[PDB]
């Protein structure tokens, strides 16, 4: 019935018994004397000189008595004030080559110090505002920023940090959610969120416990002052060896709240940032008192950033939809729409999307069916994600009705590539590198690293294990390149023209007469050397495919899908763009290396009134009129809606040359993607739901390209000694350009904007294709893993 000797105990007390732990207030279950015995505030949180050597008074919040280290409850400045010691922040940076842990410690503990809404740029305020944090940052390992997951809200990001999973996989797809199987709603406030049914994957504290590594309780009732959260972690670190946890978390609600109230750039942000730094100082001084400051690994990390958003910048659905009372909207910095009643027969989600599409010239949001959202968001494969999504412009809100000087000036939740949404990462301790800056990375990657830091085997997750090995002084995980599953055929020129009945045509009979004299036509030669700079992609599933060589490009032609899985080619800085001649406009040529039965047919395209075709290697970038004939082979053709061809042709005729001109040449790999069930993974044949009329030619859901060059732009892409530079895209293969409100204009006014929105990581394409890229480079495999997780954000 009492918390005497039980405050913040790690023991698991079940109902109906009254609790004394971290979360007892959140379940309204604390013992009667919890708030007096456990939440002591008397005399504050700092020893003063007059308290040194005091007789312990149990009413005090913390202690300055000679027994306080034994009881695990000294004020964090005890040794500084009472024993002549220095504050941790005033000590020189000194390298930590190996953990320096006291007797009985079997591994370096990990402490995760999570700060809500800590925008990356807040680090610019520097040592005068945040000296402790700046010391951690400069002395340890840090990134310029860390990318959160979408939506850029607390619960999805905190659970992603904990699991290594995208929200669509871990299940916490918003701060608010409705699950139609449960027929229940989850909210940041209330009891429903405590039900385990909502939470998938395997978070770090469970991974640890299952593997015999003791975890502290990661969560803190909001009533518990930050100073007490720090003192409680320090108390647990003082426990005997068989009770003491190896992994801990601290959470602060700041600077998110001040960001919401004052906006991210307010001068009012200074004080909350000082207060957080003061708490970091208490932790570090407290660790130093326990001789753990060169033993513990500390991660300082945020969940997302903060943008300027005021009530004046609100769009209302009632200004677009005449029947707004028939819908429910999850509102604000994103929109999710569903029917207010399932019994409604009037609600048509096609009419909703149409009514929200490009209706006002300065419209500050864009509707999408969830399968059409940028694939980089990985935000579709969950029954809790409504079919209808609104991507809201940064700085704006979307609300249902106008009834919904402002009370708030900041918010977050926007697209996770937006600058204002970026957050922070610092690692400090023996296992992290010393005085080391690392490139920006995604928070999905951290679970693997935290498992490594605790000697744990990670549960399956969406990180790329090894991509963050460069953060650590000592790695225990060494990644290995996956084995190729399907081996290609290398077919020669074996068939005659007469064997093909594809209905294809090239009246004039245009032909390179010289091909009949060219015995070495379509042999390897220097094709692989010039056009496959990083080796052939490996096929990681079982299929039948052919390698096809040409002067200007190489491809891996699927005999199952009747098109390339990948097409690879290099374009020099000085390459010339040429037009398609009049006689070749509608030219498609049989490929004498590939049987008629494993080829597409032009009659399917004639009969399909909605479908046209494009080419993966562009005829516009042919090296000669002779070589241009190769680009019209049936084995280079892919099905394309006419609307999409507007995009593709601009990319191929204009942008590839632009990129080559900007980057000292580029290597391009392009191909189809099939993701009809929107799971982010390559479809099997049975999962493909649309074909070209009357044929077995499957229709891609998307088209990708990976554009690689030398990071050292003084070297051409084909003679690069060092690190690589990559940008990639996964373009939606859509039968209209409704996504692009400016699409009636010249392609120079809209196509690039579309492509930037659909930027992608090479890893995203790998999941979607079952291909493995960059298999033959001069780079270490861990460096290649970092490259494959890179996202070009265009911010
Ligand atoms: C993000 O990571 C998660 C976790 O690894 C991936 O989800 C997992 O996906 C696999 C493959 O679809 C699921 O397992 C499969 O089960 C079927 C049986 O129906 C079997 O045929 C396969 O051999 C395989 O075992 C798995 O259940 C699922 N797990 C979780 C926890 O969600 C997800 O695919 C990743 N996302 C991306 C975009 O890579
Ligand atoms: C109101 C806030 C201050 C605190 C809210 C914390 C809340 C989200 C936490 C509390 C308990 C957590 C669950 C508990 O650790 C057990 C598991 C097992 C694990 O395998 C899946 C996650 C789950 C259900 C935790 C989810 C988060 C919970 C509910
Ligand atoms: Ca799929
Ligand atoms: Na057609
Ligand atoms: Na349009
Ligand atoms: Zn948050
Ligand atoms: Zn917030």
Curated annotation (Swiss-Prot):
Q: Identify the residues that the record assigns to the SMB domain, covering every copy.
A: 1-42, 43-87
Return the protein name: Autotaxin
- Provide the function of this protein: Secreted lysophospholipase D that hydrolyzes lysophospholipids to produce the signaling molecule lysophosphatidic acid (LPA) in extracellular fluids. Its major substrate is lysophosphatidylcholine. Can also act on sphingosylphosphorylcholine producing sphingosine-1-phosphate, a modulator of cell motility. Can hydrolyze, in vitro, bis-pNPP, to some extent pNP-TMP, and barely ATP. Involved in several motility-related processes such as angiogenesis and neurite outgrowth. Acts as an angiogenic factor by stimulating migration of smooth muscle cells and microtubule formation.
Q: Provide the species name.
A: Rattus norvegicus
SMART domains from the xrefs? Endonuclease_NS, NUC, SO
Q: Is Zinc given among the entry's keywords?
A: yes
Sugar-bearing residue positions: 343, 355, 462, 742
Gene giving rise to this polypeptide: Enpp2
Q: In which family does this protein belong, per the annotation? A: Belongs to the nucleotide pyrophosphatase/phosphodiesterase family.
Describe what happens upon changing residue 116 to N: Abolishes lysophospholipase D activity
Residues the record lists as binding 1-(9Z-octadecenoyl)-sn-glycero-3-phosphate? 154, 175, 256, 412
Residues annotated as binding Zn(2+) 1:
116, 154, 303-304
Instruction: Quote the PTM field.
Output: N-glycosylation, but not furin-cleavage, plays a critical role on secretion and on lysoPLD activity.
